Structure 1
């Protein structure tokens, strides 16, 4: 064979294509989405590792566990399947080939037990999987000819399993309750009064009673899940909220990344009048945001192929790897 030097490339079209494993003790720290495979590598000193090949066609759905032990990835082609890799050994632990046309979204639960792979638009067969075995848990029929942008799960649990939420391509936002009792999923559409924005990235709060969805309209739509309703919207940043991730401080804060490369802090319990402090700047159009390790660094991924490390106390910019589109 031939020795391989540093490999670069990330798919800037899809949201959240660069995310960091929260445990940095291993040789892998960062995961980025290419066309046919993924790249697992380290953050600081560029010594790349194995590209987990094994997909027949182009990748269009990415997820990783909050514990950092599992990764999940789908593909768009005719032989559509979603596969879950392990990170301890570079091997596909799970394969699921039941979606016909393409994968829409893939997400993990708050704990590493549950998978949501509501992924099609022709047949639209919503799946909820478990990580103990490679078998189905919940089954649903979504909608003919509807696209799902992003989905997430709540940290609020009852009887050991969580409840998820997903955004359609249009206005609607569906909340799903999944149970271990019989595997019957219950869905409800949120009562959007007049807020009809295209949802870019959603994530629940710490308590789980609220979910924040940053939209293309540069505002965060807040949804209370006990009433299944929209409460308020707050405009953050001078660009649409490409990435949204809850702040690690412990309060009601949430880090967001705008279309103009501004990483700002959004407080849930705040006044109607807000002042948009930029809170440092990123040169590229930020689409992905993650927390790298215990050092307090946020890894931000841009649509221009740039990955940047931004530490806290103090705030410095350090570009990592660029890539042409």
Structure 2
């Protein structure tokens, strides 16, 4: 049976991916966006988390209700639906399918009575929904193609006939006076006056009439809402703004994040001179700022997938979680060590994590022109990764959180003017050599002591995904896109096999016994094969609702996992099939995964960036 232990995911691209739940005495203090679903988790890690999943594609907008409700928005698929989530129920409350294209932004009224939803494409509508029943005003039209960046509500002017909604769309600010009693929307464009900046975040004052807009130019533009005009501008945090939050108590203060990790306190009063001086610096680019733990922490998020807790009484910085950013492609386990898990990504970053507490043991970083880490292999003191440029880089594994040092690199391992990027790296049992598979179907065995090429093995004509080395100087590939897989020999001579199916493969694993080989096909079929047999022993049809993308295998040969585009990982007995345990927790198709060297433990990764840890007992 699969038990979900922890999910590490954060949509670092979004501004406000993570957000606190104010006055949350119960569980689920924080809510993060990682992909299709929402990770509603406690402030402290190593605690159970819930997965609010009701969408079909990525989430484009996330909104808090200042305590009481969450909201996530869809994207494409003709079902860009605004879904309201309840804290206590943890279930969808309202499903507004009124936007033909992805919902650009969504926000909640300061009194948690109104709901603003804005689309951008082919129907640009400022829908205002009541907490009871449905919508109040149809739209105000806007214009297609105008990217609605962010939105905010005025705490003041809540007389039932007025509700001032500020909307930043590109370099345009608009104040929308909404009469919900009559359901009318009047949109006044703010007179810029040579002030053209892209607003990352918007926030009204406590008493209103002063709207602070943080821009990418590290500036907060203060605009007079009453006159609907830009009043002034002050630099706040070098690097940008990101997240802008009203001060927990404040005189006129306003906490500002920065892309440099700085957190400062900007006040409108205090003259034209600022002389920036942050009171706290977090690692990475700040995108979220809130307050929780009974308003004792600042709960600052990061574009790098990080969540951090900043104490208010002593400014103490404590990390909470880290999320690998990008499309995660491979999971590796040290040959004997179950405490360290390596996760690669299409972004040039590999995270080695301590599975005991899901902390970042070490990080491997490479420039974007080096391709993406499409396969990974962990060692007691090394991380070997095959990238999108065909190169295989081995980095010195570090501890405590640091950039790893590249010990060596096999250059141009798989790049032959028709396919670049090595996939499905594997290490020899005990450790003797390194099996690698190219994007075009070439298998290559590399010495480890001298890094010299020992075998080039080219029969498969398409992508290799799922190579595996047997127990004695032999190996086998999977060869996606050509629906066949062949067991080979290191003497540069294929040993028979070459079993062809009917559909293209996606992954292949070898059991503890040297005769059992599992393959997974896009036909959502899991095929079991005996090396001594010319035909697959059996096949399980419709293993997943959608295409299966990855297959694993326990080192004992008892069970093998299967992850697919249905976001659900299942476990199947090696010989009897069946479902030992299955669960859907990734907010994306599952791309790769790895069993622990011991009985307990399965680590899977998704295309959005979500890493899910599993206890098999």
Write the distance in 2 (CA, Å) between the matches of 1:266 and 1:294: 23
Q: Structure 1 stretch 127-136 or stretch 17-26: which is displaced more?
A: 127-136
Write the distance in 1 (CA, Å) between the matches of 2:258 and 2:268: 17
Residue 293 of structure 1 deviates from its aligned partner by 2.9
Residues 1:161 and 1:286: Cα distance change in structure 2 (over 3 Å)? farther
Write the distance in 1 (CA, Å) between the matches of 2:202 and 2:180: 25
Write the distance in 2 (CA, Å) between the matches of 1:62 and 1:293: 21
Q: Structure 1 stretch 304-313 or stretch 46-55: which is displaced more?
A: 46-55
1:60/1:76 contact within 8 Å kept? no
Q: Is 1:294 paired with 2:294?
A: yes
Q: Structure 1 stretch 44-53 or stretch 164-173: which is displaced more?
A: 164-173
Residue 122 of structure 1 deviates from its aligned partner by 2.0
2:243/2:286 contact within 8 Å kept? yes
Write the distance in 2 (CA, Å) between the matches of 1:43 and 1:62: 18
Residues 1:295 and 1:106: Cα distance change in structure 2 (over 3 Å)? closer
Query: Gaps spanning 5+ residues in structure 2: where?
Result: 326-617
Query: Gaps spanning 5+ residues in structure 1: where?
Result: none
1:61/1:103 contact within 8 Å kept? yes
Write the distance in 2 (CA, Å) between the matches of 1:36 and 1:319: 25
Residue 70 of structure 1 deviates from its aligned partner by 4.3
Residue 138 of structure 1 deviates from its aligned partner by 4.4
1:33/1:39 contact within 8 Å kept? yes
Q: Structure 1 stretch 234-243 or stretch 288-297: which is displaced more?
A: 288-297
Residue 171 of structure 1 deviates from its aligned partner by 1.6
1:72/1:83 contact within 8 Å kept? yes
Q: Is 1:245 paired with 2:245?
A: yes
User: Secondary structure at the residue paired with 1:13?
Assistant: coil
Residues 1:185 and 1:296: Cα distance change in structure 2 (over 3 Å)? same
1:75/1:82 contact within 8 Å kept? no
2:62/2:70 contact within 8 Å kept? no
User: Secondary structure at the residue paired with 2:279?
Assistant: coil
RMSD, aligned CA: 1.5
Residues 1:255 and 1:76: Cα distance change in structure 2 (over 3 Å)? farther
Residue 166 of structure 1 deviates from its aligned partner by 3.8
TM-score with structure 1 setting the length:
0.96
1:200-254 Cα deviation digits (max 9, x unpaired): 1000001111100000000000111111111100001111000000001231000
1:110/1:162 contact within 8 Å kept? no
1:165-210 Cα deviation digits (max 9, x unpaired): 3444432100001113321100000000000001110000011111
Write the distance in 1 (CA, Å) between the matches of 2:323 and 2:70: 26
1:254-293 Cα deviation digits (max 9, x unpaired): 0010110001000111211111111121011111111113
Q: Structure 1 stretch 118-127 or stretch 240-249: which is displaced more?
A: 118-127
Q: Structure 1 stretch 9-18 or stretch 176-185: which is displaced more?
A: 176-185
Write the distance in 1 (CA, Å) between the matches of 2:157 and 2:10: 34
Q: Structure 1 stretch 119-128 or stretch 303-312: which is displaced more?
A: 119-128
Aligned residues: 325
Residue 108 of structure 1 deviates from its aligned partner by 0.3
Write the distance in 1 (CA, Å) between the matches of 2:53 and 2:273: 49
Residue 314 of structure 1 deviates from its aligned partner by 0.6
1:109/1:162 contact within 8 Å kept? no
Write the distance in 2 (CA, Å) between the matches of 1:233 and 1:185: 28
Write the distance in 2 (CA, Å) between the matches of 1:77 and 1:20: 29
1:261/1:281 contact within 8 Å kept? yes
Q: Structure 1 stretch 46-55 or stretch 165-174: which is displaced more?
A: 165-174
Residues 1:275 and 1:35: Cα distance change in structure 2 (over 3 Å)? same
Residue 47 of structure 1 deviates from its aligned partner by 1.1
1:255/1:263 contact within 8 Å kept? yes
User: Secondary structure at the residue paired with 1:168?
Assistant: strand
Answer 1 or 2: higher relative contact order, Cα 8 Å, separation at least 6: 1
1:255/1:266 contact within 8 Å kept? yes
Write the distance in 1 (CA, Å) between the matches of 2:262 and 2:279: 7
2:151/2:168 contact within 8 Å kept? no
Match of 1:200 in 2: 200
Residues 1:191 and 1:68: Cα distance change in structure 2 (over 3 Å)? same
Q: Structure 1 stretch 55-64 or stretch 289-298: which is displaced more?
A: 289-298
Write the distance in 2 (CA, Å) between the matches of 1:46 and 1:71: 25
Residues 1:23 and 1:253: Cα distance change in structure 2 (over 3 Å)? same
1:52/1:90 contact within 8 Å kept? yes
1:11-41 Cα deviation digits (max 9, x unpaired): 0001000000002211110000011100001
2:153/2:163 contact within 8 Å kept? yes
